[PDB]
Amino acid sequence: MIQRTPKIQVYSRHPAENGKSNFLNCYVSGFHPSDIEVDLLKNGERIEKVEHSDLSFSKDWSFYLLYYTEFTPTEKDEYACRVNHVTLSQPKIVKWDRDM
Amino acid sequence: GSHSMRYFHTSVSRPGRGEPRFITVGYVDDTLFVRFDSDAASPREEPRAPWIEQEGPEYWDRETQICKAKAQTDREDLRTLLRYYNQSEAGSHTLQNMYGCDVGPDGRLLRGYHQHAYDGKDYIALNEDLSSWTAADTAAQITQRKWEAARVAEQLRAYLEGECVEWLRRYLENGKETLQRADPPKTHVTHHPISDHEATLRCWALGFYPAEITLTWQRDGEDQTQDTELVETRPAGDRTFQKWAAVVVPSGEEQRYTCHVQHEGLPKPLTLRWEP
Amino acid sequence: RRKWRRWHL
Ligand SMILES: [Cu+2]
Ligand SMILES: [Cu+2]
Ligand SMILES: [Cu+2]
Known part of the structure; x- marks a missing residue:
């Protein structure tokens, strides 16, 4: 088995606007095998009620998954996506930069 | 534009936690429209785009029947692959399978696919000629053997040239609002x-x-x-x-x-x- | 829609 580590992007569905309702997305792709823990965090605490798309895969057979949830951004709230995978010695956390 | 249709399958064994997990999705271009998750309660194939909901109940009974037999087939095949690679029953393994077709502006077949991967590595693939195989190793050669003696290429080729193109063209009409914009x-x-x-x-x-x-x-x-x-x-x-x-x-x-x-x-x- | 027939590895 050739195990691949996930690429992680955390980003909002629409450009962020403080006070306007949006969607927070954690796009994990490129990983193998498929078992993965993915959590969206709000100021360090896991968000309940996160939905996920169904397991699918790219041409090279690596998997990709989108986790997402309703949120309404504020300036002082920091969001992050936490991902644990077999390839990872410790859970990687990518914070949400609204610039990206 | 140029359009495509694909069905993606993943079977993931989990020894000691029941049957293998089977998830399959179907796409037209970059639009997901069907899904089947064996870990759903009483699983049927479900719609995931409005232009497929119109299909009748027989459509959906035929799709669910297929997803179930495929999940069964990957349960056999997952155990078979343990023999072909001299592996343990302790471990978790992954069988992937993608098949589908590409069509051009004319609506005619540009290319058909049907390829397999085991634990993330190419296993056996139908070649672009839809009549010959590429076996990734001596295990997949056992399959190329079993599939040449069954004329599977001939039958995949019949599907990929006929029905695949047939129904993709249909979906491009039922969903022309979005699939064609x-x-x-x-x-x-x-x-x-x-x-x-x-x-x-x-x-x-x-x-x-x-x-x-x-x-x-x-x-x-x-x-x-x-x-x-x-x-x-x-x-x-x-x-x-x-x-x-x-x-x-x-x-x-x-x-x-x-x-x-x-x-x-x-x-x-x-x-x-x-x-x- | 899906192809009716599959084949054992
Ligand atoms: Cu400057
Ligand atoms: Cu077109
Ligand atoms: Cu059988």
Whole structure:
């Protein structure tokens, strides 16, 4: 088995606007095998009620998954996506930069 | 445009935690329209786009019947693959399978697919001639053996040339509203001061369907293919897609650099500068 | 829609 580590992007569905309702997305792709823990965090605490798309895969057979949830951004709230995978010695956390 | 249809299958064994997990999704281009998750309670194939909900109950009974037999087939095959590779029953393994077709503006077959992967590595694949196989190893040669003696290529070829193209053309009509409309990307150039010494220019493309798009940073009209940061194309979540391309540029030499956007939803390729 | 027939590896 050739195990691949996930690429992680955390980003909002629409450009962020403080006070306007949006969607927070954690796009994990490129990983193998498929078992993965993915959590969206709000100021360090896991968000309940996160939905996920169904397991699918790219041409090279690596998997990709989108986790997402309703949120309404504020300036002082920091969001992050936490991902644990077999390839990872410790859970990687990518914070949400609204610039990206 | 140019269109495609694919069915994706993953079977993931979990010894000691019941039967293998089976998930399958179907796509027309970059639009998901069917799904079947064996870990759902009483699983049936479900719709995932409005233009397929119209299909009658027989459509859906036939799809669910297929998904169930396929899940059964991967349960056999997962155990068979343990024999072919001299592996333990303790471990978790993954059988993937993708098949489907590509059609051109004419509606005629451009290419058919049907390939397998085991634990993330190519196993056996139907070749583009839809009549010969490529076996990745001496285990997949056992299958190429069993599949040549069954004329599986002939039967895959019958499906990929006939029904695959038939129904993709149908879906492109039932969903022409969305499947045949290209959402052009909304583009903007951002300027990010990193330090006193340099700033980063990010070329954004947002809200575009399909996912095919090319973003390129040119320096003096010359492509900075090596020194350009380019993220994998990502789903917005509402069916559209996002991407950005970025370059770290010296302050002042900014106006040398051009960003070129190519997308079938755009009449002309775009030319974007950072504009204060 | 899906192809009716599959084959054992
Ligand atoms: Cu078209
Ligand atoms: Cu059987
Ligand atoms: Cu500047």
